[PDB]
Structures are given as structure tokens and as C-alpha cells.
Amino acid sequence: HWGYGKHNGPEHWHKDFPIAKGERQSPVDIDTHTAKYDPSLKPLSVSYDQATSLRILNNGHAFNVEFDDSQDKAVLKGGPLDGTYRLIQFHFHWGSLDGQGSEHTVDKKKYAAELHLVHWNTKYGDFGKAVQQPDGLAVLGIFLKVGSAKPGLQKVVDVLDSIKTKGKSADFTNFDPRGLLPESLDYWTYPGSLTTPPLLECVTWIVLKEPISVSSEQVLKFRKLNFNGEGEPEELMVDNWRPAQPLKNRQIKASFK
Ligand SMILES: On1ccc(C(F)(F)F)cc1=S
Ligand SMILES: [Zn+2]
């Protein structure tokens, strides 16, 4: 099945998921000089005060921190969005080395990791119906660079030992995702897709300009996770990022001058 190795990695995905070569695939390189400022964009509204985290799962490709999305509790609205999008989970993509790991790049620069906070458009009722629509998801993408530790990330890092292999989960209540945000909500936005199979073209991407800093010890602990299941040969969970895809007929808009 699909993965990130030589024989099942991004260059193979198109055979099972032909939309891999579609018209609005993600990630992309963000050319800062050509992303035009759009004064019609609204500020982004990130309302996470009432977020209810439930569980953390190693899914064999990344780890997901899952939220109760049965009520409007943690929502994204404003910016390029029409309507209200409800947080369902966040995850990261990261590298084997600090010099790679992010999926979006900025003038070809790769960051050490990228955080994706996934939200679905509540006009569609649930996540499953939202991923059948071209405006079904909004993903807030935040870059990670290695420097100072991010204190708000340490509860995630400290639980990873309990979910080392594919299929493991752990209780993960009362985690506050506000502690993962940078100071600025300046962003770039464009229409795209999930960056993992099934690569669905549902996503309004909102990529924050300001990275957060994590420590080398924090990211090292992400790199001790395993793609394999318990009892299988160890394959470290590293380099679970898809490279930049053709921009095609899309414009990337900036929320800031
Ligand atoms: O990487 N990744 C994996 C899953 C999902 C979704 F939307 F399906 F939840 C989004 C992304 S970016
Ligand atoms: Zn992702």
C-alpha cells in the first residue's frame, strides 16, 4: 500500500490515486515574490478556547491528535473562508534531518517539519460528506524550525513513546492546540488537496508565514516513531512529506503586505 519509501512513495501514488496528477494538488512552493497581497482577505479567526482533544493515534504514516468535533467547539473562520470549519485533528510531516521535512516550501526553502490542523466545513454535516466537496476542508499549515523548544508541544512529544508503532493509540485529553500557534496569523492561501492519499481536492490551504521554533530534542523524538507495526522490522517514521507539485492554473494570495 502507499507510503514514503522507494517503492511506494510519492512518485508511485498516481497509479492508485490518479488525482495525484490533478489540477489542484498539494503541497506547492510558495514563491513570495509572486504571491500577490489580497486586501479583500479577512483576518483569520482561530477559536480554539473550547477545543476538546480526545486521543493520539499512530496511523502508520504520521500521528493524529484527534478532537471531539460533535459540537462547534474549535473553529476556523474568516481569512479566505466562507462559513465555519470545525477542527477534527492535527498532525505533522517531518524529515530525517533538520534541513528537510516540510511539505510547502517558501522560495524553495524546506523547513524541518510542518503542522497541519485539519478542519471541515460544517455546511456539509460531517467530515465524510465534506471531503466530497471542493470547499469541504480548510487546513492551517504551520512550519517548524529547530531552535528554542516549544513548551506547548512537549505534552505531545512526551506521549510518543506510548504510540511508537502503527495502530497504537493513547488517551490524549485536555490538550490545548493554542500552544502550537506562532504570534502572527499572516498567511498565504491557495486551493489544493490532501497531501496524502487519497489526495482529495477539497482543501483551502492557509499557510502561516511565521514558523514556530521547536528544539532539536523535540524533533528527534518525532523521528523515533515507527511506520511499522508492533513486532515488525523497525522503519523509522521520518521523511513523511510529499514534495512540491506543479502550481498549474492557480494563484497564491498573501494576507499581508
Ligand atoms: O496529511 N494529511 C492527512 C490526512 C488529512 C485529512 F484531511 F484527511 F484529514 C489531511 C492531511 S494534510
Ligand atoms: Zn498533512
Coordinates of C-alpha atoms and ligand atoms in Angstrom, one line a residue:
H1 CA 0.0 0.0 0.0
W2 CA 1.1 3.5 -0.2
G3 CA 4.0 5.0 1.9
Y4 CA 7.1 7.1 1.7
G5 CA 9.7 4.5 0.6
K6 CA 11.3 3.9 -2.8
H7 CA 8.7 1.5 -3.9
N8 CA 5.6 3.0 -2.6
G9 CA 6.4 6.7 -2.2
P10 CA 5.0 9.9 -3.8
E11 CA 6.3 9.0 -7.3
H12 CA 4.1 5.8 -7.2
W13 CA 0.9 7.3 -5.8
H14 CA -0.7 8.2 -9.1
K15 CA -1.2 4.6 -10.1
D16 CA -3.8 4.0 -7.3
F17 CA -4.8 7.7 -7.0
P18 CA -4.8 9.3 -10.4
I19 CA -5.8 12.6 -9.0
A20 CA -2.1 12.8 -7.9
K21 CA -1.5 14.4 -11.3
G22 CA -4.7 16.6 -11.0
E23 CA -5.2 20.3 -11.4
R24 CA -5.0 21.4 -7.7
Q25 CA -2.5 19.2 -6.0
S26 CA -0.6 20.0 -2.8
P27 CA 1.9 20.9 -1.5
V28 CA 3.4 23.7 -3.6
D29 CA 6.3 26.0 -3.4
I30 CA 5.3 29.5 -2.3
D31 CA 7.2 32.0 -4.4
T32 CA 6.9 35.0 -2.1
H33 CA 7.7 37.5 -4.8
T34 CA 4.8 36.4 -6.9
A35 CA 2.1 35.8 -4.3
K36 CA 0.1 38.9 -4.5
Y37 CA -1.3 40.7 -1.5
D38 CA -5.1 40.5 -1.5
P39 CA -6.7 43.3 0.6
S40 CA -10.1 41.6 0.3
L41 CA -8.9 38.8 2.6
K42 CA -10.2 39.0 6.2
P43 CA -8.1 38.4 9.2
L44 CA -8.1 34.7 10.1
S45 CA -10.3 33.8 13.2
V46 CA -8.9 30.8 15.1
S47 CA -11.3 30.0 18.0
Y48 CA -9.7 27.1 20.0
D49 CA -10.8 28.0 23.6
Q50 CA -13.3 25.2 23.8
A51 CA -11.2 22.5 21.9
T52 CA -11.6 19.0 23.3
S53 CA -8.8 16.7 22.4
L54 CA -9.5 13.0 22.9
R55 CA -6.8 10.7 21.7
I56 CA -3.5 10.4 19.8
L57 CA -3.1 7.7 17.1
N58 CA 0.0 6.4 15.2
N59 CA -1.7 5.7 11.8
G60 CA 1.3 4.2 10.1
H61 CA 2.1 7.4 8.2
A62 CA 2.1 10.2 10.9
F63 CA 0.4 10.6 14.3
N64 CA -3.0 12.2 14.6
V65 CA -4.2 14.2 17.7
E66 CA -8.0 13.8 17.4
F67 CA -10.7 16.2 18.7
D68 CA -14.4 15.9 19.5
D69 CA -15.9 17.5 16.5
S70 CA -19.6 16.6 17.5
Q71 CA -20.4 20.3 18.5
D72 CA -19.0 23.7 17.4
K73 CA -16.1 23.8 19.8
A74 CA -12.9 24.6 18.0
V75 CA -13.4 26.5 14.7
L76 CA -11.6 28.3 12.0
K77 CA -13.4 31.1 10.0
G78 CA -12.5 34.4 8.3
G79 CA -9.5 34.8 6.1
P80 CA -10.3 33.3 2.7
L81 CA -13.1 31.2 4.1
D82 CA -16.8 31.3 3.7
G83 CA -18.6 29.8 6.6
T84 CA -17.2 27.9 9.6
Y85 CA -14.8 25.0 9.6
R86 CA -14.6 22.7 12.6
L87 CA -11.2 21.2 13.9
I88 CA -11.1 17.4 13.6
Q89 CA -7.4 16.5 14.0
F90 CA -3.9 17.8 13.7
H91 CA -0.7 16.0 12.6
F92 CA 2.8 16.8 11.4
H93 CA 5.0 15.9 8.5
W94 CA 8.8 15.9 9.2
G95 CA 12.3 14.9 8.0
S96 CA 15.1 12.6 8.9
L97 CA 17.4 15.7 9.1
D98 CA 16.7 19.3 10.1
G99 CA 17.2 20.5 6.5
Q100 CA 14.1 18.8 5.1
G101 CA 10.6 17.8 6.4
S102 CA 8.1 20.5 5.4
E103 CA 5.7 19.9 2.5
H104 CA 5.2 23.5 1.5
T105 CA 8.3 25.3 0.7
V106 CA 8.9 29.1 0.7
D107 CA 11.1 30.2 -2.1
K108 CA 12.3 26.6 -2.3
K109 CA 13.3 26.7 1.5
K110 CA 12.4 23.4 3.3
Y111 CA 11.6 23.7 7.0
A112 CA 12.3 20.9 9.5
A113 CA 8.6 20.0 9.8
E114 CA 5.1 21.2 9.1
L115 CA 2.0 21.1 11.3
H116 CA -1.4 20.6 9.7
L117 CA -4.6 21.5 11.6
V118 CA -7.5 19.9 9.7
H119 CA -10.9 21.4 9.7
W120 CA -14.2 20.6 7.9
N121 CA -16.9 22.9 6.5
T122 CA -19.9 22.5 8.8
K123 CA -22.3 23.2 5.9
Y124 CA -21.7 19.6 4.9
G125 CA -22.7 18.0 8.2
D126 CA -19.6 15.8 8.8
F127 CA -16.1 15.2 7.6
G128 CA -17.0 12.3 5.3
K129 CA -19.5 14.4 3.3
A130 CA -17.2 17.5 3.4
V131 CA -14.4 15.5 1.5
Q132 CA -16.8 15.1 -1.4
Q133 CA -16.8 18.8 -2.0
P134 CA -14.2 21.2 -3.4
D135 CA -14.6 23.6 -0.4
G136 CA -15.0 20.8 2.2
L137 CA -11.7 21.3 4.2
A138 CA -9.5 24.1 5.5
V139 CA -6.0 23.1 6.6
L140 CA -4.0 25.5 8.7
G141 CA -0.3 24.8 7.9
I142 CA 2.5 26.0 10.3
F143 CA 6.2 25.5 9.7
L144 CA 8.6 24.2 12.3
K145 CA 12.2 25.3 12.6
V146 CA 14.8 23.9 15.0
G147 CA 15.9 26.3 17.7
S148 CA 14.3 27.0 21.1
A149 CA 11.8 24.4 22.5
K150 CA 8.1 25.0 22.1
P151 CA 6.7 24.4 25.5
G152 CA 3.2 23.8 24.2
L153 CA 4.5 20.9 22.1
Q154 CA 6.1 19.0 25.0
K155 CA 2.9 17.0 26.1
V156 CA 2.7 15.7 22.5
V157 CA 6.4 14.7 22.5
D158 CA 6.2 13.0 25.9
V159 CA 3.3 10.7 24.8
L160 CA 5.1 9.4 21.6
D161 CA 6.8 6.6 23.5
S162 CA 3.3 5.1 24.1
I163 CA 2.4 5.1 20.5
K164 CA 5.6 4.0 18.8
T165 CA 4.1 1.7 16.2
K166 CA 1.3 1.7 13.6
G167 CA -2.2 1.2 15.2
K168 CA -1.2 2.2 18.7
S169 CA -3.3 4.9 20.4
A170 CA -3.3 6.7 23.7
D171 CA -5.8 8.9 25.7
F172 CA -4.9 12.5 25.0
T173 CA -7.5 14.7 26.7
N174 CA -7.2 18.3 27.7
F175 CA -4.5 19.3 25.2
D176 CA -4.7 22.9 24.1
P177 CA -3.7 23.5 20.5
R178 CA -3.4 27.2 21.1
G179 CA 0.1 26.5 22.4
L180 CA 1.2 25.4 18.9
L181 CA 0.5 28.7 17.2
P182 CA 3.1 31.4 16.3
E183 CA 2.4 35.1 17.3
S184 CA 1.4 36.2 13.8
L185 CA -1.6 34.9 11.8
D186 CA -0.2 36.4 8.5
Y187 CA -0.7 33.7 5.9
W188 CA -0.7 32.6 2.2
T189 CA -3.7 30.9 0.8
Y190 CA -4.5 28.8 -2.3
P191 CA -6.8 25.9 -3.3
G192 CA -5.3 22.5 -3.1
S193 CA -5.6 19.0 -1.8
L194 CA -4.7 16.5 0.9
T195 CA -1.0 15.8 0.7
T196 CA -1.5 12.0 1.4
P197 CA -3.6 9.6 -0.5
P198 CA -6.4 9.8 -1.4
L199 CA -5.1 13.2 -2.4
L200 CA -8.7 14.7 -2.5
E201 CA -9.0 18.2 -3.9
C202 CA -11.1 19.6 -1.1
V203 CA -8.7 21.9 0.7
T204 CA -8.4 25.7 1.1
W205 CA -4.9 25.9 2.3
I206 CA -3.9 28.6 4.8
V207 CA -0.1 28.5 5.4
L208 CA 1.2 30.8 8.2
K209 CA 4.3 33.0 7.3
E210 CA 5.8 32.8 10.9
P211 CA 7.3 29.4 11.8
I212 CA 7.3 28.1 15.3
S213 CA 10.6 27.0 16.9
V214 CA 10.9 23.5 18.3
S215 CA 14.1 22.1 19.9
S216 CA 16.4 19.6 18.3
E217 CA 15.4 17.2 21.2
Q218 CA 11.6 17.6 20.4
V219 CA 12.0 16.8 16.7
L220 CA 14.4 14.0 17.5
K221 CA 11.6 12.3 19.4
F222 CA 9.2 12.5 16.4
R223 CA 12.0 10.6 14.5
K224 CA 11.9 7.7 17.0
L225 CA 8.3 6.8 15.9
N226 CA 7.9 3.8 13.6
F227 CA 5.9 3.4 10.3
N228 CA 5.8 -0.4 11.0
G229 CA 3.5 -2.2 13.4
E230 CA 4.5 -3.9 16.7
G231 CA 6.8 -6.8 16.2
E232 CA 7.8 -5.8 12.6
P233 CA 11.2 -4.7 11.4
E234 CA 11.8 -1.2 12.5
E235 CA 11.3 1.5 9.9
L236 CA 11.7 4.9 11.5
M237 CA 8.9 7.3 10.8
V238 CA 10.9 10.0 9.0
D239 CA 10.5 11.9 5.7
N240 CA 6.8 11.5 5.6
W241 CA 6.4 14.5 3.4
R242 CA 5.3 14.9 -0.2
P243 CA 7.4 17.2 -2.4
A244 CA 6.1 20.3 -4.1
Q245 CA 3.6 19.8 -7.0
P246 CA 3.0 21.8 -10.1
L247 CA 1.2 25.1 -9.4
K248 CA -0.8 24.8 -12.7
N249 CA -3.6 27.3 -13.1
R250 CA -3.5 28.6 -9.5
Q251 CA -2.6 31.9 -7.7
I252 CA -1.3 32.0 -4.2
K253 CA -2.6 35.1 -2.3
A254 CA -0.9 36.9 0.7
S255 CA -2.9 38.2 3.6
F256 CA -0.1 40.8 4.4
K257 CA 1.9 43.4 2.6
Ligands
LIG1 O1 -1.6 14.7 5.6 N1 -2.9 14.7 5.7 C1 -3.6 13.5 6.1 C2 -4.9 13.5 6.3 C3 -5.7 14.7 6.1 C4 -7.2 14.6 6.2 F1 -7.7 15.7 5.8 F2 -7.8 13.6 5.6 F3 -7.5 14.5 7.5 C5 -5.1 15.8 5.7 C6 -3.6 15.8 5.5 S1 -2.8 17.3 5.1
ZN2 ZN -0.9 16.7 6.3

